[PDB]
Amino acid sequence: DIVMTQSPLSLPVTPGEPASISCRSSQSLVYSNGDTYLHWYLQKPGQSPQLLIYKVSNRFSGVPDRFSGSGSGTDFTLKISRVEAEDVGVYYCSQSTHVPWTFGQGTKVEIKRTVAAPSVFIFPPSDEQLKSGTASVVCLLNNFYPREAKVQWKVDNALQSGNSQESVTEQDSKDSTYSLSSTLTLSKADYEKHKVYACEVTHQGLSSPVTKSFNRGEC
Amino acid sequence: DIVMTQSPLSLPVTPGEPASISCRSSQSLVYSNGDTYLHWYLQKPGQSPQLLIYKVSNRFSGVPDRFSGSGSGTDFTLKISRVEAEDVGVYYCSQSTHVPWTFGQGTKVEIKRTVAAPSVFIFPPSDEQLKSGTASVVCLLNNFYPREAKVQWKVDNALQSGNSQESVTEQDSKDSTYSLSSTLTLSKADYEKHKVYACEVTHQGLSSPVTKSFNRGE
Amino acid sequence: EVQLVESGGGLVQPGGSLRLSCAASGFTFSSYGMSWVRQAPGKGLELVASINSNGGSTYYPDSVKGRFTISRDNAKNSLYLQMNSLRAEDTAVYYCASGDYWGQGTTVTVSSASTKGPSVFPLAPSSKSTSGGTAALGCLVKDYFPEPVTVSWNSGALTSGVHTFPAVLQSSGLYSLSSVVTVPSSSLGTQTYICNVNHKPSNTKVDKKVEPKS
Amino acid sequence: EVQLVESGGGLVQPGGSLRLSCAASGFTFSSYGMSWVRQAPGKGLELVASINSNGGSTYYPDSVKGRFTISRDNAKNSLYLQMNSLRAEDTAVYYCASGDYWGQGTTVTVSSASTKGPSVFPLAPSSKSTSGGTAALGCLVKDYFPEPVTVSWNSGALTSGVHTFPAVLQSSGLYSLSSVVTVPSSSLGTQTYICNVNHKPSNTKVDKKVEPKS
């Protein structure tokens, strides 16, 4: 199999600034007819891969000029002259010169936008879920940047550990932010014997850690 | 008020080719601080207006370089270096130098893509609607270009007129095509006393007219 | 993220009144002049009223001067438009706007006629009725008033291949439209198809399943 | 207008089998080599099988060679993948592709566990639970298996401000996620909010209204 290798795999770019991805193949990509079947694909968040450049340098239908491809033999380059917010996603180089079709490991372009502090919301479990025996408490960090953030749960000021899962979205193709859910799971009976439920968020856009909290059965 | 006048109002462009819109103001747009509050908005099909260029030449957030604005005083120009399919929509130049905020009439950019013939489908009226006493017959012309097309309804080979409405979609921002519905309305009783219902479509992408049809009860 | 969310639209008898509201977020709302812009279908952008940053200066075109009043609440980050002595020519989509951003707009229609909910009918597909190589199916959304109606396919899960036509006024003075979707012929059996029709002004929600009919 | 519509995905016990289908339209299907590519969440693109235009020439990586079979029906414009002796490591999204285009994919899960439908709980908004100047609300979609689930708001009409989080496997082996939306604070009273949840592998459809509550 012809092996495809990309550099880098993580690509942070201040928007408007240019970006370059290199692709090396383990063997020449020119085919018996003199053409080179080197292609670039893009997989935007939540979407299937889409064709960007085919045969080294041909812009696929709909693809803007800021995407140019170059190179030959075993050494190829994709350039994005002005990285826009919507360009965020994972880029794959690929060869179809020989069977089997192969792909690079993929390069994830990140948009280096300005710092943005998360809006933070806490949600008590519904009365409905509480009939089921489990209580889920939810904390939302919305539209922030960069992705690094710390969420700590406090119950009656006891720091929690080992009972919460996090989920982060992919970088937004419109505003280049992230969002994060942290979900504190515990027993109904466990939930009833405490009063103060609190979510504490640390992020580079917060001068000081922010806490949202609620007391069980107040509103 | 400061009157804004755009030229042209209809702008057909083969994709990849450049495009220019002129905007003239009935009065200078230079504000007393030396700045010029001439702006360009774009309203894509199905959407609110969005800001494209502010103060003559500044690209708003998210706006690509292919959009560039220039000009001074009373004469301004928006240029699109390579019109992409997604750029389809109506462009408005606008001034906020003086109250009231005013807008140009708007320029509708159309993509001049390759010819594409419509796929045609005819739909009989549902049995459910026929309970109500009316019968709608629908003919769909899907993903074609250019927009100009002719639809003729023939009931028992008798050409209809006066009892059908058309609806066209705006140009598609992904494939630059249109779609059209034609809806033949008539009474239940009227509907039941005929058998062959047909829809005939003439379009530049068709060598010869296409007919789709059904017989009531098959 | 910047949001402008209009509300309050609907149907009013001539001479009657209506209050529109706009909720803003994602920017310093107090630091910005705001305006209401309207647009009849096919027509261009007509300014209805403007108010400045602190909310102490208003402007009105003669066409609505004396009738409309643009209000502002920099605390609730809100903007209001009090419409009185409404005329039939006032029928339009009304947008809330800041210069940089526009809301999605609310629909105001002025007429001496009642509100009717839509009927929703299957535009049933078929194999034997394929147009190389897609099948087509849809929903007919008929005899409603006033605008707007919302149409989606499969609760929003189906969007590719969809076309929802502009409403058309029938000689009855009622709107009607079709929403259609094309799918590759062979995928016809593999999935179910439901159109989701919402017409707030009459509180009508219909979810019609669309099947081949045999 | 090119379409590539996969179907046939779902949950199978180890050793068991599954047949995937792909319906194509909008291009000369007979004229194109086709392939199945899969992707585990987080991982990259792994070729599963290829077939040429005819199609009398196929390839399989050793990882699935002997187990998978890629057939083609140039008449019905369709591509197939017969998967036998399925292994847990075969859990992935399977895409149908032609090189120029990719389908949305279909989800295959190989597990020694049963299918379960989700519970949908309100993530209720309030005041002064505002965060300048937006309110947040949502739906908690908990304890379902296997993937995928579909979530929308207001039958598809509400889309901006929406964040639907990636599913997470809990220690119970059941997936869970939240879908949330933020709106300008003072627009809370002016609209209703339904989350539309669909989980096909268990035939579970829920529409949950989300309200402020006292």
Numbering used by the authors:
A (entry chain I): 1 to 27, 27A, 27B, 27C, 27D, 27E, 28 to 214
B (entry chain L): 1 to 27, 27A, 27B, 27C, 27D, 27E, 28 to 213
C (entry chain H), D (entry chain E): 1 to 52, 52A, 53 to 82, 82A, 82B, 82C, 83 to 95, 101 to 215
How is this structure described in the published paper?
Crenezumab is a fully humanized immunoglobulin isotype G4 (IgG4) anti-Aβ monoclonal antibody designed to bind multiple forms of Aβ (monomers, oligomers, fibrils and plaques). In vitro studies demonstrated crenezumab’s ability to block Aβ aggregation, promote Aβ disaggregation of oligomers, and protect neurons from oligomer-induced cytotoxicity. Crenezumab’s IgG4 backbone confers reduced activation of FcγRs in comparison to IgG1 and was shown to minimize FcγR-mediated inflammatory activation of microglia – which has also been proposed to contribute to neurotoxicity – while preserving FcγR-mediated microglial phagocytosis of oligomers. The complementarity determining regions (CDRs) of crenezumab feature a very short H3 loop of 3 residues and a long L1 loop of 16 residues, thereby creating a deep paratope groove at the interface between VH and Vκ.
The antigen-binding fragment (Fab) of crenezumab (CreneFab) was over expressed in E. coli. For comparison, we also determined the crystal structure of CreneFab alone at 2.5 Å resolution. Interestingly, superposition of the CreneFab-alone and Aβ complex structures showed no major changes in the CDR structure. The root mean square deviation (RMSD) of Cα atoms for the variable domains and CDRs-only was 0.73 Å and 0.71 Å, respectively. More pronounced changes were observed in CDR residues Tyr23HC, Asn52HC and Asp101HC, which adopted alternative side chain rotamers upon Aβ binding. Another major site of interaction was around Lys16Aβ and involved CDR H1 and H3 loops. This region of the antibody underwent relatively large structural changes upon Aβ binding, where the Tyr32HC hydroxyl group shifted by ~3 Å, and Asp101HC adopted an alternative rotamer conformation.
